[PDB]
Design a protein around this ligand. Structure first.
Ligand SMILES: Nc1ncnc2c1ncn2[C@@H]1O[C@H](COP(=O)(O)OP(=O)(O)OP(=O)(O)O)[C@@H](O)[C@H]1O
Ligand SMILES: Nc1ncnc2c1ncn2[C@@H]1O[C@H](COP(=O)(O)OP(=O)(O)OP(=O)(O)O)[C@@H](O)[C@H]1O
Ligand SMILES: [Mg+2]
Ligand SMILES: [Mg+2]
Lengths: 832, 51, 396, 11, 407
């Protein structure tokens, strides 16, 4: 029951509700004033159950009707406030919202935080239920979001504040209400919510959250988002708006790390430095610089990696020998086998063996158009000039991941892209694609145009050719290149398609359409002309390339259906389908970790063609990421009976452990070698897996994600896709004549380091507490984003999923996210 | 009376069918086999009815 | 080696403030889950024989399970029926004369006893329930403080599985077997529940009273089974909580019942470090009384690291509070230092009762926001069972 | 002194 | 006055102040859980294959034949031969658990092939002896013998040279050179009962003897000798010792004798006497076969089993002296990545009254201190930090305030 206070309050409210029975003059103004006080007093209190609302369980029918008759002026409105507040406790939303809509205005703050939020929900609920059929109701609701949103901004309720605007579909106002003490909370939230949000709201959020970064002059943060939307114009403005050269310098280093090039006008000061920084010429000096501090300049040899001592010269295994002396010593600037006696080494490889070995010569020395190009002066012109493709890939590979003002790739390669010999051309187009991947340069794209139409070119020349064009125009949907690809793809004949290398033609179509699912509706329309199977296959694969990293559950559901189907011309469509889920889902950690379960189900409940793709699919999900659960999953299928699954699982292990130097993966890899010693095909690739797991002695990562895993690297996602899909048929492609395709990864090959330099670029060894990154979203205050701290004296290495923070407040980094090369600005606030 | 006899006659037939064993199912084994432990005797890989 | 049958943990959704970021992340998990169900169900439906069908006809139904004891000829073995008898059954062709091993559990034809199949994975229901499938949900960030204790328990059960190179590159053998001991309510089992939510290796659990069966050999034989499954499933951790139940100090007992418990300790004492050294099976014991365990069961070599869990210190008690008042709704006046500073030996389980109580003392006054008095009252209401016991004013 | 005793069960 | 929450009160508490996503979000979490539950059941049943051979090595046509012509034969033992007339023997056979029957041979067997006591196979129907069977090789006992020689050599057993020498004169020397024990006519002790504080080297001096055996080493579990069914403990003891006399140069190592060697006491009202009668079947058995035994607690052993008529020799594994602890250290540190200089002699005097194992954990913890801090060389400073955690950290209180009395 109640007490003297409670029972009396029940009567006092009871008298007030009852007295409104008649139309007495001193019953409407007097009573409604009392309800206004008591209801306001309790509701604007601690979370105490609003005694007025608990006692007041009356019906508004009498007052709602007389509301109209009883003084439609102020006396009418007053009743609305009392009934409206009583509505929030009950379930009368439509009426509960529309009372504050029509009733007395006053102000939202006067009622109570609990009331304000409830109106927030209903306002969002009504706005969503209100379509474009009429804005007449929108102006009032829009007016409400004008006042309430400022209410949340102050009250630590930015989450509801951002949540409130997102519900309305319109989030402009945050620009005008965010305080210097709030942009971090709001800007972080949108970046975290943007990935999950579907099209097109997700795109709108990125720009808006990007905009908020603008209003408070946090320029480097605007950079990360600008690329996330993958729109160059907003990048160019920030490039232009950055009146501070230092911020200009840094935002170029993030522009470069993404592989994004914007033609810099000479009006911009330090154009060469910005051009050289953007061209990534300074990368080589650091990489060698990084090595000297780390003491890893000495090159390695295959025998030590394999550890032949512990285990209880065919041309193939020589290739695996040749490859491991690639990746493992790649980018170190010196190899002990491919630089001194190479003519001797290659001569024990028959044709395609020569191709692979020669190409590794360029990958052994990346990012040196001079040193590598000078380490490119003893083979290519071989008595078996067939290996010319080998150095041509090395020629193209060296230019991959960098841009030189002298355009070496086109010069050397062009004279041989028309070379009649089929093998000579394979290196030309492929190597060229690596060098200018994502460049989208019209010249090289144009020069690659005749390659498509050159009928004399063999299909293997063609398949690489379309792939080469795709890798250049990755993520730009280049109308000319797409047209060339789109025009070229249609002209293909049915009989010539049935070959495996025709599997590469659609790949080039997508690689042009990576990251833009809006424009791929048309591209899938044009492809419908060609007849199946490759019509359906290209449709799926083109479909996947459209949604690279979108996080679109819809496409994944669409993609999962294709894999789910149980049918040979249908299995190519399936295999690209499973790899489809891997690419689409690999943006967010929440979804990506879930795709593992789906991948696992596709293996126990899968079929021949699917079971081969799953081992590859896991490869893209966790590239350079030795998650134990995934690495274990590849192993338990690393011995499988089907040769294709055994190979793909072994390759996946190599990718997952790429550059991680994971001891367990190595020990796991070594044991497999002993198990599969008999079969050269397994032993070759298990040996290869050990090769990928030591990429750059671990000083590189093929992960396509930078910027706290947020900023996607378009050119990268092109590479992994080529090898992975090309691995969809390993025996014809991998085990066949196309050992060179493994060089497709070189596009995404990037360094992972923590070298800290002083403001003058001298290495400034700063205590950097580096550990597993922990999200700061939704954590009030200054949450620690690093856990499992292990103070390292920079330079340092960050295994994937790690973040480094400057443990000394002596400096204030220009860019908030400490990845790659960061300009540490000495803190003016710090006092010794 | 007919409905009553039918109940009695049916219960006579059902009541001659031998009672069934009761054993703990250690674990499923496929889709048409389920390991069971009949109380006095040991393990048994029995089938499963269609129902 | 079937490989680590690690627990099945759904990804984690954080923010916890109940913001839309939370709803979206749960939806994404649900979306794939709905998608994943779709494939399982749409794989049986979309999915629409003459070799095996002949085999199943030779076997018939049912098929007995007795223990093989001798392979007399290539096509004859002696199999002991499920009652302890013997039988000179015939070995049919479909059986694999390789997996057939003395001691293996063989499938026998029911009418004419004849080896028909080898039943691997016959681990007792009493040890196959010991395996943790659904990983507990308390991550190392739910355990506050204990950074020195956690690291000690992360260098024997987590690190030796992720970066094995460090240990084998230095000559150590990763410490294997840690005795978590301390006063009641300090966090012994929570740190254990946290290694299961992070580890990628099969996490068997026991309660130190499950492995004492009534039968004379049922006891020592369940322990020999548990360490057979843990070894079988590759990387594994066996968590024998409340180890004081089985392994107390050996003594000349004049009671046969108590000589069978010790005949179970002297099995766990040999299934850990005895002839035929172990493989990769770590053991995490816990106990509130390390002063009664046998000097052998905690002799360095079986329990290498004796993590000691003292009652919370003042800094930890302040971190313990926030981990349990993270989801609460404290008013601006809730300055926790008033309660933490006290010299009361407030355990870490006491802190979560001073949180449950101070949140229920809020419903008393009809408030979902706990003020500062809601903790002062709760501290007293939650602080009994320990009263006040100490010396008088003798010491100055 | 006075000792209470448990017991097993030889099947 | 703790007013109970009125139903009117409850409605407000749960809706007033609710974050508009609360009902939806809590719905999403509830949906997932049920969804996960359903997900497992549709797939939880994982096929457990039943060990069928490859399709090539099948003879399904002949398989139907074996099941049809050949019949199951109960395995029995001939306990006597009546030899009614020497022409109609009328053998008596034991069916193990079934019963004892006076049976006669099926024509296939020869009257002279079934010798008294040998395992005999009978037919389910009449129990006529169809076939002789090889003597019983126990499935458990046969696995007991250590088929893979333990890797620990005698150079890994440090600080116990006089205790190893005392063992080598009972377990190795009288087995490789049975001429020094004959010239003087000394009867070799046919068993030693290694006792010592837990973790002093009892089972390492056991594996070491196994690596240099030249014999058949049987590792008695202790657990298997205590079986549920009555008597099956003793039946195993005999079937182990019997498996030794058959072999030449057999060593039996009963690790943890306390399991089945408890001091006798009348407890017949319980299964304990089942274990005791298994020891009395071992005491009879004990008193070319040498026997070893390890017991960290010898005082709980039956006085009868420790007499010098069964365990002729009792080697005491004491805590090492200083000249041995510096040797136990070097044995475990020969593979560690230590800095060349370590004053192991110094680390021996900081581990007073420390066993041969706690010296090992000092070496294992020493690195863990070198791994916590990224130094790949486990320097001396680490060990003193190691000896503080392994030995001192659990040795005693004996602390500064109570240790400023010693100088
Ligand atoms: N340091 C701590 N940080 C956070 N929570 C803690 C801490 N210590 C204890 N707890 C809390 O204690 C609760 C239960 O205690 P816990 O299970 O850890 O005890 P225990 O060691 O198993 O005790 P016992 O000796 O009774 O078996 C957990 O839910 C956890 O939230
Ligand atoms: N004296 C020692 N010398 C060398 N290593 C030792 C010594 N004592 C113990 N160890 C180490 O410990 C291991 C096992 O210890 P030990 O063999 O003494 O156990 P135990 O005596 O059987 O113990 P318990 O009697 O409780 O079963 C050895 O293999 C070795 O690694
Ligand atoms: Mg506990
Ligand atoms: Mg022992």
């Amino acid at each position: 029951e109640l007490s003297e206070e409670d029972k009396q309050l029940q009567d006092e409210l009871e008298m007030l509700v009852e007295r409104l029975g008649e139309k007495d003059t001193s019953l409407y103004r007097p009573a409604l004033e009392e309800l206004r006080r008591q209801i306001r007093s309790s509701t604007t209190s601690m979370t105490s159950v609003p005694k007025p609302l608990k006692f007041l369980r009356p019906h508004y029918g009498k007052l709602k009707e007389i509301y109209e008759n009883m003084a439609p002026g102020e006396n009418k409105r007053f009743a609305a406030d009392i009934i409206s507040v009583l509505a929030m406790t009950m379930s009368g939303e439509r009426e509960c919202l529309k009372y504050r809509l029509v009733g007395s205005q006053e102000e939202l703050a006067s009622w109570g935080h609990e009331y304000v939020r409830h109106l927030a929900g209903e306002v969002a609920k009504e706005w969503q239920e209100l379509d474009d059929a009429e804005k007449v109701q929108r102006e009032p609701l829009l007016t409400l979001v004008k006042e309430i949103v400022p209410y949340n901004m102050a009250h630590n309720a930015e989450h509801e504040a951002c949540d409130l605007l997102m519900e309305i579909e319109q989030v402009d106002m945050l620009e005008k209400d965010i305080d210097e003490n709030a942009y971090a909370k709001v800007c972080l939230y949108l970046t975290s919510c943007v990935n999950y949000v579907p099209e097109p709201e997700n795109s709108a959020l990125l720009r808006c959250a990007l905009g908020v970064f603008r209003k408070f002059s946090r320029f480097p943060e605007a950079l990360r988002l600008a690329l996330m939307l993958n729109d160059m114009e907003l990048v160019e403005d920030i490039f232009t708006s950055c009146k501070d050269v230092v911020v200009q310098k840094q935002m170029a280093f993030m522009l470069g790390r993404h592989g994004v090039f914007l033609e810099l006008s000479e009006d911009v000061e330090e154009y060469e430095d910005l051009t050289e920084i953007m061209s990534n010429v300074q990368l080589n000096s650091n990489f060698l610089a990084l090595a000297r501090e780390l003491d890893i300049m000495e090159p390695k040899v295959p025998d030590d990696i394999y550890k032949t001592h512990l285990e209880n010269d065919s041309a193939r295994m020589n290739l695996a020998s040749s490859f491991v002396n690639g990746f493992v010593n790649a980018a170190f600037g010196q190899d002990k086998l491919l630089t001194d006696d190479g003519n001797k080494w290659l001569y024990k490889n028959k044709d395609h063996g020569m191709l692979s070995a020669a190409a590794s010569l360029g990958m052994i020395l990346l990012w040196d158009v001079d040193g590598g190009l000078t380490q490119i002066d003893k083979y290519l012109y071989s008595s078996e000039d067939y290996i010319k493709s080998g150095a041509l890939l090395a020629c193209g590979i060296v230019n991959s991941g960098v841009r030189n003002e002298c355009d070496p790739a086109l010069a050397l390669l062009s004279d041989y892209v028309l070379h009649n010999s089929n093998t000579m051309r394979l290196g030309s187009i492929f190597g060229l694609g690596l060098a200018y991947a994502g460049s989208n340069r019209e010249d090289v794209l144009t020069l690659l145009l005749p390659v498509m139409g050159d009928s004399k070119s063999s299909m293997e020349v063609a398949g690489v050719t379309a792939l080469a064009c795709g890798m250049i125009a990755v993520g730009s949907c280049n109308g000319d290149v797409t047209s060339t690809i789109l025009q070229t793809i249609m002209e293909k004949s049915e009989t010539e398609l049935k070959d495996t290398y025709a599997r590469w033609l659609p790949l080039g179509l997508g690689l042009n359409h990576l990251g833009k699912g809006e424009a791929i509706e048309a591209i899938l329309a044009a492809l419908e002309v060609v007849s199946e199977p490759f019509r359906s296959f290209a449709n799926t694969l083109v479909d996947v390339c459209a949604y690279a990293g979108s996080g679109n559950v819809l496409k994944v559901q669409q993609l999962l259906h294709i894999c789910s189907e149980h049918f040979a011309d249908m299995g190519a469509h399936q295999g690209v389908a499973v790899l489809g889920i891997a690419l689409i889902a690999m943006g967010e950690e929440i979804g990506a970790e879930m795709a593992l379960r789906t991948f696992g189900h596709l293996l126990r409940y899968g079929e021949p063609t699917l079971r081969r793709a799953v081992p590859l699919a896991l490869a893209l999900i966790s590239v350079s990421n030795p998650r134990l659960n995934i690495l274990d999953t590849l192993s338990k299928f690393s011995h499988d009976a089907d040769p294709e699954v055994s190979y793909n699982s072994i390759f996946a292990m190599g990718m997952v452990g790429s550059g991680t130097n994971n001891a367990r993966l190595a020990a796991m890899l070594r044991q497999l070698a002993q198990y599969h010693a008999k079969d050269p095909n397994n032993l070759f690739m298990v040996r290869l897996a050990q090769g990928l797991t030591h990429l750059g002695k671990g000083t590189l990562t093929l992960c396509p994600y930078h910027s706290d895993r947020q900023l996607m690297s378009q050119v990268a996602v092109a590479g992994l896709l080529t090898v992975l899909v090309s691995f969809l048929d390993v025996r014809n492609i991998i085990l066949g004549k196309s050992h060179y395709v493994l060089y497709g990864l070189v596009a995404a090959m990037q360094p992972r380091m923590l070298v800290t330099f002083d403001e003058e670029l001298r290495p400034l060894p700063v205590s950097v507490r580096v550990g597993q990154a922990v999200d700061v979203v939704g954590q009030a205050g200054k949450p620690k984003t690093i856990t499992g701290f292990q103070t390292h004296t920079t330079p340092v290495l960050l295994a994937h999923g790690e973040r480094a923070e400057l443990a000394t407040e002596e400096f204030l980094p220009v860019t908030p996210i400490l990845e790659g090369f960061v300009i540490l600005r000495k803190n003016p606030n710090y006092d010794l | 009376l007919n409905a009553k006899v039918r109940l009695l006659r049916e219960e006579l037939q059902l009541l001659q069918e031998q009672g069934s064993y009761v054993g703990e199912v250690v674990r499923a084994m496929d889709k048409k086999k389920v390991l069971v432990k009949v109380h006095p005797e040991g393990k048994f890989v029995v089938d499963v009815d269609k129902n | 080696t079937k490989g680590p049958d690690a627990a099945s943990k759904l990804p984690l959704v954080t923010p916890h403030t109940q913001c839309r970021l939370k709803l979206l992340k749960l939806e994404r998990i649900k979306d794939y889950l709905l998608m994943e169900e779709e494939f399982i169900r749409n794989q049986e439906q979309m999915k629409p024989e003459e070799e095996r069908s002949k085999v199943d006809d030779l076997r018939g139904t049912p098929m007995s399970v007795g223990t093989l004891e001798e392979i007399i000829d290539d096509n004859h073995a002696i199999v002991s029926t499920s009652v302890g008898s013997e039988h000179y059954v015939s070995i049919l062709s479909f059986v694999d004369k390789d997996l057939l091993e003395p001691g293996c559990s063989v499938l026998l034809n029911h009418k004419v006893h004849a080896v028909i199949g080898v039943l691997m994975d016959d681990t007792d229901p009493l040890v196959t329930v010991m395996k943790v499938e659904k990983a507990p949900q308390e991550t190392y960030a739910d355990i506050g403080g204990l950074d020195n204790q956690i690291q000690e328990i992360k260098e024997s059960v987590e690190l030796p599985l992720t970066h094995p190179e460090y240990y084998e590159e230095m000559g150590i053998k990763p410490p294997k077997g840690v005795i978590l001991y301390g006063p009641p309510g300090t966090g012994k089992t929570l740190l254990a529940k946290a290694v299961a939510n992070q580890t990628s290796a099969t996490f068997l659990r026991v309660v130190g009273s499950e492995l004492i069966q009534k039968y004379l050999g049922d006891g020592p034989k369940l322990v020999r089974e548990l360490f057979r499954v843990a070894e079988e499933h590759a990387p594994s951790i066996v968590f024998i909580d409340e180890i004081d139940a089985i392994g107390t100090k050996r003594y000349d007992s004049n009671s046969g019942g108590e000589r069978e418990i010790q005949r179970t300790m002297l099995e766990l004492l040999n299934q850990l470090d005895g002839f035929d050294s172990r493989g990769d099976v770590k053991v995490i014991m816990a106990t509130n009384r390390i002063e009664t365990l046998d000097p052998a069961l905690i002799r360095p070599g079986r329990i290498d690291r004796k993590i000691e869990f003292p009652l919370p210190d003042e800094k930890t008690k302040k971190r313990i509070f926030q981990i349990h008042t993270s989801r609460m709704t404290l008013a601006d006046d809730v300055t926790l230092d008033d309660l933490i500073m006290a010299k009361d030996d407030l355990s870490g389980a006491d802190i979560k009762a001073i949180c449950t109580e101070a949140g229920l003392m809020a419903l008393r006054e009809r408030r979902m926001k706990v003020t500062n008095e809601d903790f002062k009252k709760s501290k007293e209401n939650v602080l009994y069972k320990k009263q006040e016991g100490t010396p008088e004013g003798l010491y100055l | 002194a006075x000792x209470x005793x448990x017991x097993x069960x030889x099947x | 006055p703790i007013r109970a929450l009125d139903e009117g009160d409850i409605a407000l508490l749960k809706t007033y102040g609710q974050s508009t996503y609360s009902r939806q979000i809590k719905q999403v979490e509830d949906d997932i859980q049920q969804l996960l539950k359903k997900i497992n059941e549709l797939t939880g049943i994982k096929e457990s294959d039943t060990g069928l051979a490859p399709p090539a090595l099948w003879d399904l046509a002949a398989d139907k034949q074996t099941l049809q012509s050949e019949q199951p034969l109960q395995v029995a033992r001939c306990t006597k031969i009546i030899n009614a007339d020497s022409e109609d023997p009328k053998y008596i056979i034991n069916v193990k658990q079934f019963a004892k029957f006076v049976v006669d041979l099926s024509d296939q067997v020869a009257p002279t092939d079934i010798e008294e006591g040998m395992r005999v196979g009978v037919d389910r129907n009449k129990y006529q002896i169809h076939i002789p069977l090889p003597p019983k090789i126990d499935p458990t006992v046969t696995m007991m013998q250590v088929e893979e020689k333990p890797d620990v050599t005698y150079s890994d057993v440090g600080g116990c040279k006089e205790q190893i020498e005392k063992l080598r004169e009972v377990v190795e020397t009288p087995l490789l050179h049975p001429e020094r024990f004959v010239n003087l006519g000394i009867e070799p002790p046919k068993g030693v009962l290694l006792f010592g504080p837990p973790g002093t080297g009892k089972t390492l001096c056991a594996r070491a003897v196994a690596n240099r055996t030249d014999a058949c080493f049987i590792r008695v579990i202790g657990s298997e000798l205590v079986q549920k069914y009555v008597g099956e403990g003793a039946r195993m003891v005999r079937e182990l010792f019997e498996m030794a006399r058959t072999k030449k140069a057999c060593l039996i190592f009963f690790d943890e004798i306390d399991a089945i060697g408890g001091a006798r006491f009348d407890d017949g009202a319980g299964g304990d006497n089942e274990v005791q009668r298994t020891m009395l079947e071992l005491i009879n058995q004990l008193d070319n076969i040498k026997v070893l035994m390890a017991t960290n607690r010898p005082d709980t052993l039956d006085p009868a089993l420790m007499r010098p008529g069964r365990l002729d020799r009792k080697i005491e594994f004491s805590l090492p002296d200083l000249e041995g602890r510096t040797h136990i250290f070097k044995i475990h540190a020969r593979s560690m990545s230590v800095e060349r200089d370590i004053r192991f002699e110094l680390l021996a005097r900081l581990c007073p009254n420390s066993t041969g194992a706690e010296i090992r954990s000092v070496c294992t913890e020493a690195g863990m201190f070198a791994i916590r801090a990224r130094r790949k060389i486990a320097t001396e400073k680490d060990f003193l930090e190691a000896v503080n955690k392994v030995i001192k950290s659990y040795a005693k209180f004996s602390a500064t305030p109570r240790y400023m009395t010693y100088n």
